[PDB]
Each structure stands twice: as C-alpha cells, then as structure tokens.
Amino acid sequence: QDLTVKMTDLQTGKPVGTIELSQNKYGVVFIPELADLTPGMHGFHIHQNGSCASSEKDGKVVLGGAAGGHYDPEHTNKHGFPFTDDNHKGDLPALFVSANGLATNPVLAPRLTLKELKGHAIMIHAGGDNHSDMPKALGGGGARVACGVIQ
Template structure:
C-alpha cells in the first residue's frame, strides 16, 4: 500500500467511528443476579435538541420487547419486600419528580418522567437501537438508575400497573 492510501483509509475510519462526546455519559449495565451482576454492555446517554437519547450497546438479553425506565435511586442493589428478595429493588420506583404516581408514554406530561420507550432486543440477544426521552435532560437523570425489565411495556397502568412489564433484569447507575 502506498502512503496516501494508508492515510486515506485511516482518516476515513476515524471519521466514521462514532465518538463518545465529553458531555455524554456511559452507563455500564449488568444482569441482576443474587450473587452480583454479569456485565452485558453499556448505554450511552446524550442530550439532544429533542431530549435525551439512550443508545444501548447490550448483549445477553432475551429477544423481544423490554420495559426500560429511569428509576429514582442511584443503586442497583437488591432489597427485601414482604420477606422476598427484589433484585435491583434499591433503585426504587420509576423516576417521578412531579409525584404523578402514574405510568405513561415518554412524551406525555402527566406521568413518571422516567418512563422510556421499550428496548427492542434482536434474536441474538443484542440491542443497539437508540431511544428518545423528550421530557428529560442529562442533568435530570444523573445519580439515578437505568433499568431493563423482562417483557414489554404498554405505557399504561391498565390492565396491569407500571406498563405490565416484568421483573427487573438489568441495571446500571447513571453517574
């Protein structure tokens, strides 16, 4: 290879690699287990003109839709409720600074601010499709937990509370 071709290839690869900006926050995510967490990747959180963008780079999840939320507390530790261990329970409930006590869509104004679009996980257990939370800023979510739930989310409290999603399966703390 000649020097121009090498330089051109290098510059092209540098230009097309999506850098993480200094303002972005990288959240390390781990599966929730009783004996610690198994790392499954990261989620990059960025402010945009349209709200906060959550870009997952995760693997090891079950295929299909998964509920995805910002939780009130910056912890992924387990807690105990009614004598049972709740994995990720120390994260508390969905981030709800306005005390609406209502689950809804990420773009509606009378519900938890921590309600995010569902994550869509591919057949191979990976997800990398960004989702947008138009009512949040990066400053809002710092110090909170980011949670992936088993099963989808209908963004309603009916017929089941909190979107009908299942157990907490993966978590990371937003620094």
Template sequence: MSRFLLLAALGLPLFSGAALAAEVVVPMTAIDSSGTGAALGTLVVRDGKGGAVVTPKLSGLGTGPHGFHVHENPSCGPKEQDGKPVAGLAAGGHFDPDKTSRHEGPYGHGHKGDMPALAVNGDGKATDAVTVPNLKVADLKGRSIVIHAGADNYADQPKALGGGGARVACGVVPEPKAKATKKM
C-alpha cells in the first residue's frame, strides 16, 4: 500500500496539468575598466521548446544590435591584458564546452554561448526575446552573460569573435530555480 501511495504522489505532477521548468533571472549592470556600474535591468532565461528563451528587460544601452554571449566564468570584473584593465575580461571567453574554438553564431556548430543579437531600440531599451537553440538554463550555472558594444557578424573574420567590440554590460548567472508552469 505504501508503495502505491509513493508512486501516486510521484506521478501526481504528471497529471495535474503543471510541469516544472527551469528559469533564471540575471541582473545586468554596466561595466567598464574599473568594474561594474549602474544597474541596467534583467534577463529572464527559461527553457523553451526550441532552446533557451532569453527575455531582456534592459535600458541604458546604445541603440542598435549588440553582440550577446554566455561567457565561461561567473565574474563581470575587469582583468589586465597587456598591462591595462579591460572591462569584463574576468568573464573569460565564450562558453565553449565542446572546445570547438569556432564562432559561428547561435545556429552554427561553434561556441555554445553564441546568442542571437540583442536588439536595442531608439530609447536604449531591449525587450525582444531571443531563442538560443544550442542552450539550456542548466548550461548557465557558473557562467556570466556579456553584452558587447557593437553588432556580431557570427564569424572570426575580419575580426575575432564576431567583432562586437568592447564588453559594455554583464551579469553573473545565479542558481536556476524550478518554476511551476501550466501545460496547455
């Protein structure tokens, strides 16, 4: 009898019309060579059918498309390069667990941390969600998300890593939380 009750209790969520979906809210801040600065808003990341869905709620960014990537380390601090502090360099390189060493964008077979461009409107706000097909919320644990000053061409030519330029915003990813959602 107790086995039946245990199995019934474990199966209840399957029949209740609810499921658990991973979700994480990443606070984003401006960064420069001296460290982190003003809060810019958040990114809400959840698992979707086609990959991770990233919904920005950001303001205070430059207008236009921005390179947007998951980086290897959970840090947004500056780090020295050639004797000078560089904004967000402590975040490390693009998240590349398969060691491809290729920058092919979110739909290629390169870095897993390559995300679609972040679109910023004329008011400096970004609110349009993007889907990252090669990524899940669980992949973000122990990482950071970086926004670059310019657009990303999803190639290593003519400039390495898409040519997005300086790192202008960053957020350290907190622990993902399970969130009950209704199935339709």
C-alpha cells in the first residue's frame, strides 16, 4: 500500500514534484520529492476537502481555498503537534526545504492511516509551523503555496 501524490504550485500552476505516502507500523510516512520551493521550514498539513481550486473570502481570492481547513475528524478546532491528540489530525511535522530549493526529508504522522487520507488535499504553506494557534493561528503557515489531491 503506497500512493504518489502530484504537487502543484498554486501561484505558477506548474508542478513541483511528488510525495509518496506509505503505511508502516508507526504511522503514515510522507516521502517528499519536491523542488522549486523557498528554503526553510514550511507548514505541512492535510486539509478537509479534496480540491486545490481557489476560493473567495470577503471579496478576495484565496489560492487553494477550496481545500477548506485542516483535516479534523475529531472536531478539535485546535491546531497542534503531530503527536498530540487534542488538535487537527491533519497536523503533520513541518516540511524542510534545503538551500537548493529541494525537499527530500521524509516525515512521520503517528496519528494517521492511509485509508482515511483518500479524498483529502495535501497543503504546503509559505510560512512555517510552530504547532500552535499562537501568536498566529494555524501555526503561522499563512498563504498556501503548493497543493495536491490524494486519490
């Protein structure tokens, strides 16, 4: 059981690579093979709706907005760590992008399973993720730069 997800830059509309999802004894592993991203730590989460289309919010366009909020089947309404149960189950460890703009560092999500991810969108944000709604909500990820639908 292994799946590959195509990731696309929402700003340019061009592909940036793929992410392989595999199931193992300790949870779901996300193995990235991305490029053309800004160096640093990027917010990385699974979102509710399976779509990367835009959305409208008070007159302004929201790239990746159709993806909705963070996957939260427990209805926790809080953003947190990948190893805490009182927050979005869609909260994954932050995504690392090297100096050359490449991301190849695999991350583990202990609270997730492969079967429940189908039909959900994988998001990559511009900012990082301190896994808290403070000082900024949703860990401070801000804008959504890359997105892909898990099918």
